[PDB]
C-alpha cells in the first residue's frame, strides 16, 4: 500500500531531522528504492524528501529522466524547479543536459506549470529573447486569467522587473493589448495598471497610446454609470499630467479641455485649476488662446460657482481682443 | 507543508476550530493571528489578504472564513479549490454547520486536515472514500475473523483442557551569441593537437583502484594542397595502450606501417575541420603505470598531528609541470605550519586547503617531500588531489613526419601537445 508507503517517507522526514542518523543510509536506500517504486504520489514525495537528503540522487535521476518529463504529471516535476535554483548563485558550469530538457519545458501549459514556468525562467535568465519569451507568458496569461487578485501579483513581479532598467522598447508597448483588457474592469486593478503604463514612456508609444487614450475617452463617455470608473479618470488625468510636463503634448488636450466643459463636479474644476496653476507657469501660450477662446463658448455655454470661480481667475488673467 | 496550519474560521474575532502542524512557540503566533484575523483590520471585503508576504487566505463562507496561511509563493487555483472544496465537505464531515456539531466531531474534522492534505499537499477527492482510510478499513476484519477464530479453536479446545484437568535551436542560439597556439597564423597548413587526458584514483595505501587514459591526434589541414598526406607515427610505449584508427583511415597500413592515411589514398581529409585520426585507450590497475606516485602519512602527535607527504616520478619520460597537489585540512584549528618542504605552498582559509606546488618533476628530480602540522585526524587530509600538465605525452607515442601520398615529399607540419588530468586523486 502506497499510503502505507508515502506515510513512511513523512516519517522518515521527521527522522531526518530528529534523529536522521537513527537510519543512517537512507538517502541511497531511497534513491534505490525510487528505482523500485512507480506510484506518482509516492514519487512526488520521495523527491521532495529525496533533495532535502541529497539532491545528488535527484540529479543522478534527472539525467535520466530528462525526455520523460513531459509525459508526466505535474507535481513532481515542480519540486525539482526549487533545487536548481539555489545551486548556481552558489556555483554553475552544468548547462546543457539541462537545457536540452528545458526546451522541452517550453513547451510548458498547466496553469500551474506555465505560471511557473516562467517564472523560473527569469530567475534563470534575462537575456532580452528571455525577457521577451516569459513575457508573452504572462501577457496571455492575464488575458486568460480572470482572478484579479492573481493579476496583481505578476504586477507586482513585473514592478520588481523593470529594475531589467535594460528595459526594452517593446515591451513598453505591449502594454496597451493587456490594457485593453481593462475594459472588462475593476478599477483597483486598473489603477494599479495606470500607473504601471504611466512609466514607460519616454513621451513615445505615446501617440498610439494617445489615441488610444481617446479612444478611452469616448469610451468612458459611452451611457456611463461610473462608480469606479471615475476614481480611474481623475487617476488617469494624473498619469496623464505627468507626461506631459515632459512632453510637448498635442490636440488630445484640447480635447480635455472641452471634455472637462461637458463634466460636472469639483474634483476635475480642481484638476483643471492645476491645470490652470500650471499653465500659468508653462506659457508657450498658443494653445491657451484658442483654448481661451474655447473656453469663452464654454463659459458663455454655462453657470455655476465652479466656473463662477472660474472666471475669476481668468478674468485676473487677461490679455487681448482688447 | 505548504502550511503550518490550517484553522477553520467563524466570524467571532475568533477561528471556529485549528491545528497547528508544528508546536514549538505557543498560541501567540496562533494567538496573534488569531486575534489580527478577528480584527479583520477593519478592512472592507476581498477574500484574500496577504500583507507582509503573507497570505492569509480565507474565503469567507457565509458568516464563516475558512482560513489558511503561507508566506512565499503558491499556484493560486489549487488553492481555492481547496477552500472551496472546504466549503464542500463540512456539512458531510462534522455535520452541517453550527460549531456545535462540529464541537461533537472534533475529532472527524482535524482528521480531516491531515487526511485531506498532507502537508499542502492535495491528497484525493471521493469523502466517502476518504472515510474510509481509517475508522472503516477491511484488511483488519478480514485478518480478524480467521485468526480471532483460530485461536478460538484453540480456546475452545483448551475449554475442555482447562474443563476437565528546431525550434530549441532557435532560441538556444540566439541565446548562445594555459593557452595554447591559437590563431592559424602560428600553425603550419598540417597540424595536429596530440591530447590525452588522465582518470586516476589511487587508495591512501598506494593501491591503484583505477587508472584511464584517453588520448587522440586530431588532424587538421589548412590547405587543400596538403589534403592526401599520410602521417609517421612513432610508438615507442611498453603499456599496452589499445589503438583504434578512424574509420575512414586505412587500418592495415597502420597495423603495418604504423602510417596514417585514408583507407582511399585519393581522397582527401577535410579542409578546415578536425578529424580524429587515432585514439588510444588504456585502462589499467597496475600500480606501475602510475605516472605520479603520492605517499601521505599522517600521524598524530600528541596534540596535533604531523603529515608528511611525497612523491616520486615513475616514467622518467615526463616532465611534469604547473604540479599542484591539493590537501585538505581541518577547519576552525587555524593554519597550517609548515616545516621543511620542497618546493612552495599556498594556505587557503575559506577552501581550508593546503595546496603544494613544485618543483618541477623531471627524470633528474624524480622525488620530494612536505611536511607541517596542523590539529587534525588522518582523515581530514583525504582526499588528495593532483593537478599538472604536461607538454609530452603519457604515451610514448608521436608523428615525426608527414608525406604526401603522391610522391611521399615531407610536409612542414606543426604539432600541440597536451597530457591533462581529469582527476587524479589519493583517497
Given at each position: 500500500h502506497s499510503y502505507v508507503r508515502r506515510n513512511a517517507v513523512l516519517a522518515i522526514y521527521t527522522i531526518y531531522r530528529n534523529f536522521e542518523h537513527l537510519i543512517p543510509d537512507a538517502p541511497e536506500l531511497i534513491?534505490?528504492?525510487?528505482?523500485?517504486?512507480?506510484?506518482?504520489?509516492?514519487?512526488?514525495?520521495?523527491?521532495?524528501?529525496?533533495?532535502?537528503?541529497?539532491?545528488?540522487?535527484?540529479?543522478?535521476?534527472?539525467?535520466?529522466?530528462?525526455?520523460?518529463?513531459?509525459?508526466?504529471?505535474?507535481?513532481?516535476?515542480?519540486?525539482?524547479?526549487?533545487?536548481?535554483?539555489?545551486?548556481?548563485?552558489?556555483?554553475?558550469?552544468?548547462?546543457?543536459?539541462?537545457?536540452?530538457?528545458?526546451?522541452?519545458?517550453?513547451?510548458?501549459?498547466?496553469?500551474?506549470?506555465?505560471?511557473?514556468?516562467?517564472?523560473?525562467?527569469?530567475?534563470?535568465?534575462?537575456?532580452?529573447?528571455?525577457?521577451?519569451?516569459?513575457?508573452?507568458?504572462?501577457?496571455?496569461?492575464?488575458?486568460?486569467?480572470?482572478?484579479?487578485?492573481?493579476?496583481?501579483?505578476?504586477?507586482?513581479?513585473?514592478?520588481?522587473?523593470?529594475?531589467?532598467?535594460?528595459?526594452?522598447?517593446?515591451?513598453?508597448?505591449?502594454?496597451?493589448?493587456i490594457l485593453r483588457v481593462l475594459s472588462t474592469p475593476d478599477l483597483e486593478v486598473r489603477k494599479k495598471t495606470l500607473q504601471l503604463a504611466l512609466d514607460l514612456v519616454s513621451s513615445r508609444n505615446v501617440e498610439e497610446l494617445v489615441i488610444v487614450l481617446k479612444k478611452e475617452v469616448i469610451k468612458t463617455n459611452n451611457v456611463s454609470e461610473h462608480?469606479?470608473?471615475?476614481?480611474?479618470?481623475?487617476?488617469?488625468?494624473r498619469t496623464l499630467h505627468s507626461c506631459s510636463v515632459r512632453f510637448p503634448d498635442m490636440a488630445a488636450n484640447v480635447i480635455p479641455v472641452l471634455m472637462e466643459f461637458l463634466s460636472d463636479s469639483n474634483e476635475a474644476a480642481a484638476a483643471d485649476v492645476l491645470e490652470f496653476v500650471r499653465e500659468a507657469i508653462q506659457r508657450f501660450d498658443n494653445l491657451r488662446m484658442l483654448i481661451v477662446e474655447k473656453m469663452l463658448e464654454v463659459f458663455h455655454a454655462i453657470k455655476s460657482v465652479k466656473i463662477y470661480r472660474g472666471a475669476l481667475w481668468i478674468l485676473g488673467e487677461y490679455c487681448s481682443t482688447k | 507543508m505548504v502550511l503550518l496550519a490550517a484553522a477553520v474560521c467563524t466570524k467571532a474575532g475568533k477561528a471556529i476550530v485549528s491545528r497547528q502542524f508544528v508546536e514549538m512557540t505557543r498560541t501567540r503566533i496562533e494567538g496573534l493571528l488569531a486575534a489580527f484575523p478577528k480584527l479583520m483590520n477593519t478592512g472592507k471585503q476581498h477574500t484574500f489578504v496577504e500583507t507582509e508576504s503573507v497570505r492569509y487566505v480565507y474565503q469567507p463562507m457565509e458568516k464563516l472564513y475558512m482560513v489558511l496561511i503561507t508566506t512565499k509563493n503558491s499556484n493560486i487555483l489549487e488553492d481555492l479549490e481547496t477552500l472551496r472544496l472546504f466549503s464542500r465537505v463540512i456539512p458531510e464531515y462534522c455535520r452541517a454547520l453550527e460549531e456545535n456539531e462540529i464541537?461533537?466531531?472534533?475529532?472527524?474534522?482535524?482528521?480531516?486536515?491531515?487526511?485531506?492534505?498532507?502537508?499542502?499537499?492535495?491528497?484525493?477527492?471521493?469523502?466517502?472514500?476518504?472515510?474510509?482510510?481509517?475508522?472503516?478499513?477491511?484488511?483488519?476484519?478480514?485478518?480478524?475473523?480467521?485468526?480471532?477464530?483460530?485461536?478460538?479453536?484453540?480456546?475452545?479446545?483448551?475449554?475442555?483442557?482447562?474443563?476437565?484437568?528546431?525550434?530549441?535551436?532557435?532560441?538556444?542560439?540566439?541565446?548562445?551569441?594555459?593557452?595554447?597556439?591559437?590563431?592559424?597564423?602560428?600553425?603550419?597548413?598540417?597540424?595536429?593537437?596530440?591530447?590525452?587526458?588522465?582518470?586516476?584514483?589511487?587508495?591512501?595505501?598506494?593501491?591503484?583502484?583505477?587508472?584511464?587514459?584517453?588520448?587522440?591526434?586530431?588532424?587538421?589541414?589548412?590547405?587543400?594542397?596538403?589534403?592526401?598526406?599520410?602521417?609517421?607515427?612513432?610508438?615507442?610505449?611498453?603499456?599496452?595502450?589499445?589503438?583504434?584508427?578512424?574509420?575512414?583511415?586505412?587500418?592495415?597500413?597502420?597495423?603495418?606501417?604504423?602510417?596514417?592515411?585514408?583507407?582511399?589514398?585519393?581522397?582527401?581529409?577535410?579542409?578546415?575541420?578536425?578529424?580524429?585520426?587515432?585514439?588510444?585507450?588504456?585502462?589499467?590497475?597496475?600500480?606501475?603505470?602510475?605516472?605520479?606516485?603520492?605517499?601521505?602519512?599522517?600521524?598524530?602527535?600528541?596534540?596535533?598531528?604531523?603529515?608528511?607527504?611525497?612523491?616520486?616520478?615513475?616514467?622518467?619520460?615526463?616532465?611534469?609541470?604547473?604540479?599542484v597537489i591539493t590537501i585538505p585540512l581541518p577547519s576552525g584549528v587555524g593554519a597550517p605550519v609548515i616545516?621543511?618542504?620542497?618546493?612552495?605552498?599556498?594556505?587557503?582559509?575559506?577552501?581550508?586547503?593546503?595546496?603544494?606546488?613544485?618543483?618541477?618533476?623531471?627524470?633528474?628530480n624524480k622525488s620530494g617531500s612536505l611536511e607541517f602540522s596542523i590539529p587534525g585526524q588522518p582523515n581530514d587530509f583525504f582526499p588528495v588531489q593532483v593537478s599538472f600538465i604536461s607538454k609530452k605525452n603519457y604515451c610514448n607515442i608521436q608523428v615525426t613526419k608527414v608525406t604526401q601520398v603522391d610522391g611521399n615529399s615531407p610536409v612542414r607540419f606543426s604539432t600541440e601537445t597536451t597530457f591533462l588530468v581529469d582527476k587524479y586523486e589519493i583517497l
Open positions: 534513491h534505490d528504492f525510487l528505482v523500485n517504486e512507480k506510484d506518482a504520489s509516492c514519487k512526488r514525495n520521495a523527491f521532495m524528501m529525496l533533495i532535502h537528503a541529497d539532491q545528488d540522487r535527484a540529479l543522478d535521476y534527472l539525467s535520466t529522466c530528462i525526455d520523460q518529463v513531459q509525459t508526466f504529471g505535474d507535481i513532481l516535476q515542480l519540486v525539482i524547479v526549487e533545487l536548481i535554483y539555489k545551486v548556481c548563485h552558489a556555483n554553475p558550469s552544468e548547462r546543457a543536459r539541462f537545457i536540452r530538457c528545458i526546451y522541452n519545458l517550453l513547451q510548458s501549459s498547466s496553469p500551474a506549470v506555465k505560471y511557473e514556468a516562467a517564472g523560473t525562467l527569469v530567475t534563470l535568465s534575462s537575456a532580452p529573447t528571455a525577457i521577451k519569451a516569459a513575457a508573452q507568458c504572462y501577457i496571455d496569461l492575464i488575458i486568460k486569467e480572470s482572478d484579479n487578485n492573481v493579476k496583481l501579483i505578476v504586477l507586482d513581479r513585473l514592478v520588481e522587473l523593470k529594475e531589467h532598467p535594460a528595459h526594452e522598447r517593446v515591451l513598453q508597448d505591449l502594454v496597451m493589448d462608480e469606479d470608473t471615475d476614481k480611474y479618470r481623475q487617476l488617469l488625468v | 464541537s461533537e466531531h472534533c475529532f472527524d474534522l482535524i482528521f480531516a486536515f491531515d487526511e485531506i492534505v498532507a502537508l499542502g499537499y492535495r491528497e484525493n477527492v471521493n469523502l466517502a472514500q476518504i472515510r474510509t482510510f481509517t475508522e472503516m478499513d477491511s484488511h483488519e476484519e478480514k485478518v480478524f475473523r480467521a485468526v480471532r477464530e483460530t485461536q478460538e479453536r484453540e480456546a475452545k479446545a483448551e475449554m475442555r483442557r482447562k474443563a476437565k484437568e528546431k525550434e530549441v535551436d532557435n532560441f538556444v542560439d540566439k541565446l548562445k551569441s594555459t593557452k595554447v597556439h591559437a590563431p592559424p597564423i602560428n600553425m603550419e597548413s598540417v597540424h595536429m593537437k596530440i591530447e590525452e587526458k588522465i582518470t586516476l584514483t589511487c587508495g591512501r595505501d598506494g593501491g591503484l583502484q583505477n587508472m584511464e587514459l584517453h588520448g587522440m591526434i586530431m588532424l587538421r589541414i589548412s590547405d587543400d594542397k596538403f589534403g592526401r598526406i599520410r602521417l609517421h607515427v612513432e610508438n615507442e610505449d611498453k603499456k599496452g595502450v589499445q589503438l583504434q584508427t578512424h574509420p575512414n583511415v586505412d587500418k592495415k597500413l597502420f597495423t603495418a606501417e604504423s602510417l596514417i592515411g585514408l583507407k582511399n589514398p585519393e581522397k582527401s581529409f577535410p579542409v578546415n575541420s578536425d578529424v580524429g585520426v587515432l585514439k588510444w585507450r588504456l585502462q589499467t590497475t597496475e600500480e606501475s603505470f602510475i605516472p605520479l606516485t603520492i605517499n601521505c602519512w599522517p600521524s598524530e602527535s600528541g596534540n596535533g598531528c604531523d603529515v608528511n607527504i611525497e612523491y616520486e616520478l615513475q616514467e622518467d619520460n615526463l616532465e611534469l609541470n604547473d604540479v616545516g621543511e618542504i620542497d618546493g612552495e605552498y599556498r594556505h587557503d582559509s575559506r577552501r581550508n586547503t593546503l595546496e603544494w606546488c613544485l618543483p618541477v618533476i623531471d627524470a633528474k
